[model samples]
Target: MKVALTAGHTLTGKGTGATGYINEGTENRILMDLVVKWLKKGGATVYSGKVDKSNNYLAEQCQIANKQNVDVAVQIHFNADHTTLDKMGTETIYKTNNGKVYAERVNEKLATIFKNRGAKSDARGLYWLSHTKAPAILIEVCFVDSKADTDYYIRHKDIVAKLIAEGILNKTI
Candidate 1:
């Protein structure tokens, strides 16, 4: 099976929006790169969509996934809030009611992975969920600026990557 992996934003010095806790290239794209690498290692044709300066990063990712006829498309990102350092956890989003199964599966697997390492979980609505055509979900790995979460993700990149691959494999295989 083929899967599309998207790093939520441009990496050529693009800035993350207002989410002060989440940096663009620092963690989001890095997580996507790790996930793609692991996915490919698991016998899935993994495509990390074009890394370009395009403003419509999400649209570009969807286009590539559509063109490739991918079985699933997953976007990697990090969560953040302006004033709430206390608000920290992982979340996954889905578009249609039909997406619940895939969303729940990935969410459960990823949540378990994070929780086992002492992280928390939350669920919320996401625009990307409503836009993609394929079986798609957006994974917010963790926070980028929070000291505890940031240190954890940075130190355990390999484990996080493996968990992501395991989640994808659980879905595809």
Candidate 2:
């Protein structure tokens, strides 16, 4: 099946989205690289725009997937509670139930990687998720504000990507 794998925020993406010990965009790009490769290994048609160093953020975020008509779109990101480092773990939000399965797999696999709190399924007002023709899931891999999570993500970024790929393919790690 066709899929869109997005590194949620980058210089050319969601814009230095969140910051703490690590910049979300920088870490996201690195993690997404592995996501793309593992997705290819899982034998899925993958779509990404990592090279457009200067792009229309919204268009670049959802346009290609929307135009190409992919089965599902996954945005890779890390959440932050800059005020305190208490919030931690992974969270994935689905635009509809259509993405719940994929999000579930991602959340399950990520739990082994980090302490995944839970999965989210709802009709949120996210741009890429809401505007897309296909189902979408935006994954906040971990919390950037926490040092443990930052290190966990950095150390297991590849595994996280693999989990994302497996989820996209509906496979287990």
Candidate 3:
């Protein structure tokens, strides 16, 4: 399948996400590259997203997927609840049925290592979910603010990336 894979947030600048035990922007790219490697290894055509600035990062990401006419568009990100360092888990967001299906699969795979926050169709104002022409899933792999999540992520990032690729391709890698 053709896949549009985007690492959440800009490489550096305004679009940066969670920052605690991990810098979400930096780590998102790191994990995304690994996911891309596995996705390619599994014989999938992958389209990557790039945004030099945060001005239109979300729009640019979806544009890559839409223009490429990919089967699915996936965004990888780490979550964070600044309200509490105790909050932690893996969750996925989608706006359409197909998106939800992919979201659930990816969430289920990641939950094997992190807490399951469930797949949610709560894409009200989410730019990526709403703008992509193809079914899209945004994965909050785990909470960056949680020490436990970060510590565990440090040890099993490769496996985590593989699981994400497997879930997206719906095939063992």
Candidate 4:
């Protein structure tokens, strides 16, 4: 299946998306690239979407993904509850039924690495979720503000990358 791997925020947004002990733009990109690495290894058709973190960002992101006729589009991001660093774990927002499957798979895979948070069948009408033509999932891989979350992330970055990739591939690599 073809996929569009997107990073949540970048310099183009004028806002760094989210901040804490981690840079969402950089780390999300790292996760996207790693997912691409494994997806390519599995011989799946992969296309990159817009990387701007601002000015109709999700619009451009979904546009590119649709242009490629991708089966699924995965948005990679780390979560944060700045006021409450205690809120931690992984979450995925999805729209379609197939999107939910992808979200559930990713969340289940993440549960093996971190305490998966938010909700399992987290269907949402986020811009990307509503606008994307194909199945789409936005993964908040972990909390950036939580000390325990960051520590776990720092030590198991590779594992995080691998499981996320596996989540998208569903079995491959």
Judging by lDDT against the true structure, name the best candidate. 3
For all predicted structures, in order, the TM-scores are 0.78, 0.87, 0.93, 0.88
The 10-residue segment of model 3 with minimum total lDDT is: 80-89
Full candidate order by lDDT, most accurate first: 3, 2, 4, 1
Find the candidate with the highest TM-score and give its number. Answer: 3
Location of the lowest summed lDDT over 10 successive residues in candidate 2: 50-59
Which prediction has more favorable TM-score, 3 or 4?
A: 3
Runs with alpha carbons beyond 4 Å of true place in candidate 2: 10-14, 50-56, 83-87, 122-124
Comparison by TM-score, 1 against 2, better one: 2
List runs of model 4 lying over 4 Å from the truth.
Answer: 12-15, 83-87, 118-124
Q: Candidate 4's residue-wise lDDT over 17-87, tens digit each?
A: 77788877778877777778778877789887546556666677778778878889888888877634463
Off by over 4 Å in 1: 11-22, 82-87, 113-127, 171-173
Per residue, candidate 2 scores C-alpha lDDT tens digits across 31-130 of 8888889988888888876434545566667776776878888888888886444547888888678888788878887888777777886555777677
Clashing pairs in 2: none
lDDT of the structure predicted as candidate 1: 0.65
The residue pairs found clashing in candidate 3 are none
